[PDB]
Structure formats: structure tokens, C-alpha cells
Amino acid sequence: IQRTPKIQVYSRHPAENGKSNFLNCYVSGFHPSDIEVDLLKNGERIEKVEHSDLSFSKDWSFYLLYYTEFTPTEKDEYACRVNHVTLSQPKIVKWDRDM
Amino acid sequence: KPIVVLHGY
Amino acid sequence: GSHSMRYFYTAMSRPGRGEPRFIAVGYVDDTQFVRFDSDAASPRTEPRAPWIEQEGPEYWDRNTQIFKTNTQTYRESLRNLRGYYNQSEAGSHIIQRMYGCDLGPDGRLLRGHDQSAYDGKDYIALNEDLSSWTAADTAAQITQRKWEAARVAEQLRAYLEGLCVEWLRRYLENGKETLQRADPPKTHVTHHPVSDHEATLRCWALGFYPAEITLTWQRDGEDQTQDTELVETRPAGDRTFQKWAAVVVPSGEEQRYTCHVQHEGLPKPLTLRWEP
Structure with missing residues (x-):
């Protein structure tokens, strides 16, 4: 009866160190709609993260985009922390430049 | 523009 | 429609x-x-x-x-x-x-x-x-x-x-x-060795609208549908969308592979290869 979220973590524009960009976490294919999503910089929750309005796909599963402005660097690690009723513990997906 | 409110379920 | x-x-x-x-x-x-x-x-x-x-x-x-x-x-x-x-x-x-x-x-x-x-x-x-x-x-x-x-x-x-x-x-x-x-995709192919004998070819489509798109890999002109990893099309946040398709290929065989892209904003469909 319940569907676990798919998770993608990526940037709006191609990543260039020292250049401002937007960090995106797209959660999709989940049901029911309640979901917790945070963006992390070096393991720490970023403030002022926004998200799109709740909508759903033809198969009735929900999707949301979480996003924040950011400036990638060589060293800083970014990630997306997702919790849903289908998950035993929060799922953390790291940002990979080539994904 | 949405349709007017329709009967409930 | x-x-x-x-x-x-x-x-x-x-x-x-x-x-x-x-x-x-x-x-x-x-x-x-x-x-x-x-x-x-x-x-x-x-x-x-x-x-x-x-x-x-x-x-x-x-x-x-x-x-x-x-x-x-x-x-x-x-x-x-x-x-x-x-x-x-x-x-x-x-x-x-x-x-x-x-x-x-x-x-x-x-x-x-x-x-x-x-x-x-x-x-x-x-x-x-x-x-x-x-x-x-x-x-x-x-x-x-x-x-x-x-x-x-x-x-x-x-x-x-x-x-x-x-x-x-x-x-x-x-x-x-x-x-x-219709905004056409910006496209390119990247190459990532996975072992001494295999590498991932990834075909990217970025900045396109609307979201409808076809990304396929062919080997020797033949669709590789079972061997292709296709991520869900995802929003960039500026109205446009992003997608990629990947195939793992034997090293040295990269030129037998072509990525094919179809989208409404393109003059004509693209055929792309890895360009070292």
C-alpha cells in the first residue's frame, strides 16, 4: 500500500567550484505524501531550503523538488537526508558531480 | 480555470 | 497531444x-x-x-x-x-x-x-x-x-x-x-572507467522543455534497451528538465556505441558518440 521515495541529488547548472549554483534534491514515486527532506552541508542541515508544491504522477505517486542556492567547492560535501514512513531510518544520498 | 465544486464521494 | x-x-x-x-x-x-x-x-x-x-x-x-x-x-x-x-x-x-x-x-x-x-x-x-x-x-x-x-x-x-x-x-x-x-537539450557524452576492461558511457540531456524526450544507446546501430540505465527525468528548478542514459561498454569498443536524442526543440534528432 505504500511506496518508498526515489531520490536524486544534483545541481541546476554544471558544477564549477566557486561559482554560485542551486543544489536540488528531487524526491519522487512515494506514497503517502508526508515526507521529510533536508539538504546537508558537511553533515549539517542548511536553512532556508525551499520546495515545490505537492503534485503527483499518472501512477498517483507524489513528487517534490527541494532546493537551495549554493557554491560548490573542492572540499565541501553536500547531501540530501530523506525520511518517510517506508524507511527504517533516514536515508542520506550524497551529491555526486557526475550524476 | 478549475471546474465548479462537484458532488462529494 | x-x-x-x-x-x-x-x-x-x-x-x-x-x-x-x-x-x-x-x-x-x-x-x-x-x-x-x-x-x-x-x-x-x-x-x-x-x-x-x-x-x-x-x-x-x-x-x-x-x-x-x-x-x-x-x-x-x-x-x-x-x-x-x-x-x-x-x-x-x-x-x-x-x-x-x-x-x-x-x-x-x-x-x-x-x-x-x-x-x-x-x-x-x-x-x-x-x-x-x-x-x-x-x-x-x-x-x-x-x-x-x-x-x-x-x-x-x-x-x-x-x-x-x-x-x-x-x-x-x-x-x-x-x-x-520548446527549449532543446544541451547534450554531451562522458566516459568513466569501471575496471581495466569496461567503462561507463553516459549521455546527458540538460536544459530542455517540455519534459518529453527520448534518450537511447545503440551498439552497431541496434537499440540497447535492456543494458541501458535511464534515470527519471528531473526538474532543474528553472522550468527545464534533465535526463541521462548510461551503458557499460568493453574498453576499446566505445565507437560501436551511439547515443540518440529526440526532443521537440531540436532542428533534427542528434546522434552523439564519446569524443576523447
Whole structure:
């Protein structure tokens, strides 16, 4: 009866160190709609993260985009922390430049 | 523009 | 079809945490244009695309009346559905409804839609005739009887053939510089060794609108559908979309592989190879 979220973590524009960009976490294919999503910089929750309005796909599963402005660097690690009723513990997906 | 409110379920 | 309008309604019960929440969003193609959320500090219909902002006070008042009334109607419907399934007052449940119209390239009604789901399972749908219903089970048969008594199918047919199409065509004109502009994908192929004898070829499509796209890998001119990893198309956040397709290939065989891209914004389909 319940569907676990798919998770993608990526940037709006191609990543260039020292250049401002937007960090995106797209959660999709989940049901029911309640979901917790945070963006992390070096393991720490970023403030002022926004998200799109709740909508759903033809198969009735929900999707949301979480996003924040950011400036990638060589060293800083970014990630997306997702919790849903289908998950035993929060799922953390790291940002990979080539994904 | 949405349709007017329709009967409930 | 060429263009579509859809509204998506979600109502969610939450026993012990207030009355059910109602959210409505409206889309033309892959562009959202309005929202309403009953949980908002001041619930009202709000614009989400620039081309809708020009609509007058009456439009917004009418939308907000409709969605405020739906908030109440949907709370009653959730109570009713709980009963149809002998469910306890303790669990949380969701009704979803989607409806709207599809136009072909000439702007004529291709077909209309009205579909509902309960807890993510199809519940009741208006048939393509816009006249009769398909009910999933004996609970949905009760809803069907109500809707037949209330002449719901007749009301929907009139909307879908009339106001839906009229308003869709209005929005398409008012938003023509975005809604009727197909932005082609920016494309490239990357190469990532996985072992001494294999590497991943990844074909990227970025910055495209609308979201519809075909990305395929071929080996020796033959589609590699089983061996291709295709991520879900994802929003960039600036209206555009992103996608990639990947194949693991034997090292030294990279030139037997071609990525093929089809999208509405391209002069012609692309054939790309890895370029060392």
C-alpha cells in the first residue's frame, strides 16, 4: 500500500567550484505524501531550503523538488537526508558531480 | 480555470 | 497531444492532528501555474507562473471560493470513504483527483480526463465517452450512484469540451513565449572507467522543455534497451528538465556505441558518440 521515495541529488547548472549554483534534491514515486527532506552541508542541515508544491504522477505517486542556492567547492560535501514512513531510518544520498 | 465544486464521494 | 491542462487535488486525513489538509495545483503541460493549500496562514489561490498574474480579481476570488468549498467537500468525502471500507477513525487516508483536457496540434479536444484514487489505488474514473463511469469496487459503486444522481458526468463533459479548452487556449496565448517555446537539450557524452576492461558511457540531456524526450544507446546501430540505465527525468528548478542514459561498454569498443536524442526543440534528432 505504500511506496518508498526515489531520490536524486544534483545541481541546476554544471558544477564549477566557486561559482554560485542551486543544489536540488528531487524526491519522487512515494506514497503517502508526508515526507521529510533536508539538504546537508558537511553533515549539517542548511536553512532556508525551499520546495515545490505537492503534485503527483499518472501512477498517483507524489513528487517534490527541494532546493537551495549554493557554491560548490573542492572540499565541501553536500547531501540530501530523506525520511518517510517506508524507511527504517533516514536515508542520506550524497551529491555526486557526475550524476 | 478549475471546474465548479462537484458532488462529494 | 500538443497541449494539456490538468488540476491535481490531494486531500489527506490526519487523526489527532487537525482536519484533513486539501491541496490543489494546476498545470499547463509541464508548467505549474496555480496553487492552493488549506494549511496556509491565509488560504488563497496563488499564482505560480508569470503569465497567470494578469488575471483579474474575480478570477482569483472565484478560484479561492472553489478551493475553500472543495476543502470542506473533501473532508466529508474522506469520512464517507472511511465508512465504505469499514476503516477505523485512527488511520490517515488520502483521496487524489486529477482532471483536465488534452488538445491536439490544431487546438481541438483530443480527450478529457477525470480520475480518482483512494490511498494510491484507482477508485473511480470517467470513461473516455465523458458519459459513463468505471468503479473499482463496491465502495466506488456508491460514489458512482451519487455522481449519477448529481449529473456529474454531464457537468464534466460540458466543462471538458467547453471551459477547459477555452481557458487552456487562453493560457497558451498569454504564456506563448514559454508554453509554446520548446527549449532543446544541451547534450554531451562522458566516459568513466569501471575496471581495466569496461567503462561507463553516459549521455546527458540538460536544459530542455517540455519534459518529453527520448534518450537511447545503440551498439552497431541496434537499440540497447535492456543494458541501458535511464534515470527519471528531473526538474532543474528553472522550468527545464534533465535526463541521462548510461551503458557499460568493453574498453576499446566505445565507437560501436551511439547515443540518440529526440526532443521537440531540436532542428533534427542528434546522434552523439564519446569524443576523447
